[PDB]
Symmetry: D3
Subunit: 253 residues, 6 copies
């Protein structure tokens, strides 16, 4: 077998990819989302009740479908990053990255030694299909994609330094964390926050990195797409399930 090509990673340079957040934390729900036709699905190990085993079940569900899987670990934890890569996650989204030093550690965490620090266990890994991908250890690094989140004042304070890290493929802006950090918790739509988001997207792209964001606000999402944002998540499964059931009930009260 050849290593699974990371099309998400290639398309960061060629198109704008539309994403759906997957926080229902279940292989069955992940498969439902996989049928819709999103460019990428974000399996959330930070804000949904997921662990390595439940994320593996969702990777296995999604794998039959063209949607690219991206996984968010709970934090930039080197050993957890090792575990998620070995179950076969090819694109990681690291929350709350706040320095070039931390971003560089995340780059190494995703790459085999001697250049990186990713632990080696290809005989045991779905990532290598248990060495049925016979050249995995040679071809793995080329298909790994690292995305880091800037979503704090310290992240913004180190933005130019993070953008100079070779191996950071994309910077994703987190409006919920960033608006709370700025003292506008629950209110990212305020002009003070949105002007910082727009300037941040412009700086990310000017440095030759892919920019990303999540917004369930259709008008904001379309504005970010108009600015050239490369990876835009446009909703969340938990939110769509709740809202669709509420809207239906309201027709009957």
């Amino acid at each position: 077998m050849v290593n699974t090509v990371n099309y998400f990673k290639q398309k960061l340079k060629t198109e704008q990819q539309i994403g759906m957040w997957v926080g229902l934390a279940d292989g069955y729900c992940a498969e439902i989302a996989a049928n819709v036709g999103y460019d990428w699905l974000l399996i959330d190990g930070e804000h949904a009740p997921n662990d390595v085993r439940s994320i593996l079940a969702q990777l296995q569900s999604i794998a039959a479908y063209p949607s690219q899987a991206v996984v968010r670990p709970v934090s930039g934890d080197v050993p957890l990053i090792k575990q998620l890569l070995d179950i076969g996650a090819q694109t990681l989204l690291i929350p709350m990255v706040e320095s070039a030093e931390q971003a560089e550690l995340m780059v190494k965490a995703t790459r085999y030694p001697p250049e990186g620090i990713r632990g080696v266990g290809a005989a045991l890994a779905r990532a290598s299909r248990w060495n049925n991908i016979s050249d995995y250890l040679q071809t793995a690094d080329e298909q790994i994609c690292l995305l880091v989140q800037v979503e704090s004042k310290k992240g913004l304070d180190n933005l130019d330094e993070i953008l100079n890290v070779d191996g950071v493929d994309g910077i994703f802006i987190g409006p919920a964390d960033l608006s709370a950090a700025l003292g506008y918790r629950g209110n990212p739509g305020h002009e003070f926050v949105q002007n910082i988001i727009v300037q941040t997207i412009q700086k990310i792209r000017a440095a030759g990195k892919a920019a990303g964001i999540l917004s369930a606000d259709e008008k904001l999402a379309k504005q970010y797409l108009e600015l050239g944002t490369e990876f835009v998540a446009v909703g969340v499964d938990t939110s769509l399930l709740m809202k669709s059931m509420k809207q239906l009930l309201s027709k009957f009260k």
Copy 2:
């Protein structure tokens, strides 16, 4: 502790109850549905990948919320009915009921001996809260509700006979199975099917039983409510999740 009052069962005589089908087969998804405010939630053990243990998880999730749980077993199987009653399901929906003889057996399956054949194991049952409901074996039968589905030609051929069974609280019409049985598979909206459905609702209510139905078609659901249908399910969680995610993606393609 007092036995949990079956408000669904009482309200069969006092109001029209709006329902949501729960086929996502998971305690987490069942809780999301429980927050919306439906009168009843149908945990589907016939057409969703559920078993006694996954249904128990969903009963435990929903139990903190006012929505009444109804469970559909895969068939009118007496020992499975015993298992579902003991994990604490107070309202059952039996598919494909086709005779007064079968409806009477379902009545007995839901009631303790000597009047019925429900197996006795109150020390072990969530239903009795492990005997923390001190008088459960005396008070249980009063709070159990039996619903049967008419959804075949043979069911329609035995409708008057099923409607004379004491202990059948409600008859639910299944438009998907019934339209297929009538040779209009995938097309319940046809006049030939709808005339049979409307006449069937009228007969159910004339015999003093509650009538029920599921339709994801808003106009049909409102027509059934106008006709006095007592328990109307108006959508399905799997369908709403898929439709909401597809409608969103179509705004961005």
Copy 3:
């Protein structure tokens, strides 16, 4: 490897075995029970929320301990009996047995062809340790033990006929089901019920079969042991957990 000797089955003829009911339906809780020193543990697939997979987890937990595992299926279902034997349950307790014809079917359901109807799949079975027990298909039948429950009027009406079935190792009396069948639901302690239980134990033993029963009433349990009852379960894990936690709280209200 040698087939696991069924010591429960041997001891039916040599001693009185003390049992604990296991309805917590989990491998971890079963292991806690397995540490205490009961002669037998009853994994309840009738009145606790168990299935083949949860029962397997409990067999694996208990297997490291001398306590003998007995499994109760939800009903006398031939294919389910096949599944339980293959995961390695060596003693079955069949509820609600009501005729010599049904008891004979249960005997055949536990024995390989050509003398019985137990389905053959030794390559896949924990029971054979995946054929690591090299002569399993020759040695299996000798270590299987069948227990049937008499706990209805129809069972009592067929008691002498059930007691003449070769291959029925034991008859277990279910006081909860029997007292409900007799119109004393929740009140097995009534003299009318107890006189029937005592006469039944005497007839079981007169016919050279092992007698069994469950009672959480210490005085009744000791009376049954004084009458020579071979397998007596003396409590239930769910009941002991609830009572122990309630008695403790009552010291502090």
Copy 4:
């Protein structure tokens, strides 16, 4: 989306398909088997500790790979057959089929009304991808494959009658059950059994049906392939895992 084409079903008429039995009862183990390149994988719900939910996880794992999934239910149970079809199993292997009447019931169990009795719930079914296969109810039946097992004296007594059932796509011979039925339990390699197997294969093919078998004996498997047997399973995951670990240990004792 178009309905998933059942290539296993087509290839019954065009080639000989090599199979692997999947009894490790786990989505992770099923995915390992899916990487090897077998024409078909048999997810065993009869002799491995599987249920609807664990079979669904294995279907989801395998679905990313070319291997065709075949599922064996514990028995020819109409409601269980309904459940397995709705989770998306397109080929079923029914054990212990013993009459043309039973085979005909299995045909109906796999087909929608009005011609069959498969329950209709396409909104809830992975089989329809929750109606994302928009014409599922029209196109489903064409991709369902029914295989029945002949593996008892009564099955052999009704072989010609079973072979005249329209809708039976294949007859699979079970050597373990059949050798035990014939009084050669554990010894299917005896000439008396093998002559009956060879005559049975010849009769199945003469009637224009696909013949199948499992044998872990390479010489027997190759003989069955030389006789034109259309679907031949050549090993079992549990057996290969045990044997590979034992052979390795024996090099070191």
Copy 5:
């Protein structure tokens, strides 16, 4: 919907709350505990085999009952604290707190930016009921309760400094860890240990903080309640299950 009021947190100032430790690590066992009537239940993620997903199942079980849930994470890990708050735990018990610096970090870990560092993901959180609690991000912090454990010499060496941390609602003494730290492992009952515990309770309360402790010794527990200790756990589910089953067997040996 209104944010769930943290009654445990209010009652720290108005009454003495009786607790039960929940280490059976399962939603079903947690529900049994929830029926008894304890003021609080401690879901142990430090000393019972729990993770975010098993803790979530137990929160869902308990939620239908008045008992207040308190969760103990394995350590004072900021990202794990984030995960536990989002699944909706409103009271945390942090083990092995040893400095005012660590206690201050734990305060911030429980509070939203800009005043704290709790990660923001209300669209995905059971805690906000997936934003069905419309003002969650404004009302969340007020209902969060932080308890820290003093149970080492270094904790005792920093007690006065920990007691001056605003946002520490309570200090819980761990007698097992503390007696081991003091060189009396397995012997907390020694006067040397007890005099330190009593002095510590008095200092906690003198500083206007709630004091807590676990003791399964009824006499010690009642002494702690007479000293005014606000939150006293009086037993452990695993210990009560084992002891209850052993005491019963001893009546029969």
Copy 6:
């Protein structure tokens, strides 16, 4: 009950123990491996999709068999080590140990206070059988075995210093991580790597510590056994399952 004797730990001084890696991450697969007769089984929490709960299931499966369980946590994380010891793992294998300071911290992480920092919760621990091992807190430390991995340049740079740590029972060489660290990723068989491995084994044994290694290469494994290596793992369950299934298919293509 007496504490389970750690025979693995004793045999480090009296024989050479043959091991199998268990990465199938499931209680059912762990039991299959347990039947073969390996001296030790390595439940891999670093390179297989395991967590505390899935490792517990595997410890419970294996516990009925003489094979000694060794657990590898994802990293030298003190609170995770606490969790693994309490579910009853008596031998740990810590990856990527790089200093005497880190090895000393791992020694303390495995021993109760006051000498170590292992958290005390014996009422809740499978390790104490919930205190059914009456003197566990006095007898525990004697049966715990600590193994550390040297598998980086920094580990080799600190080898003499790690070998002088009292409480390190064994040093295990990781050829996959070490060959990658040395710039021969996927090529441990190179003379440059093998000379370092052989010299490292000689130094480990000269310092009076047990030496260990994993090699799926039969010749290398036998060379390591000839050199006196005390604990040699000779294969991996995932690799054997894949290889056995591929070798079989190649006989039929």
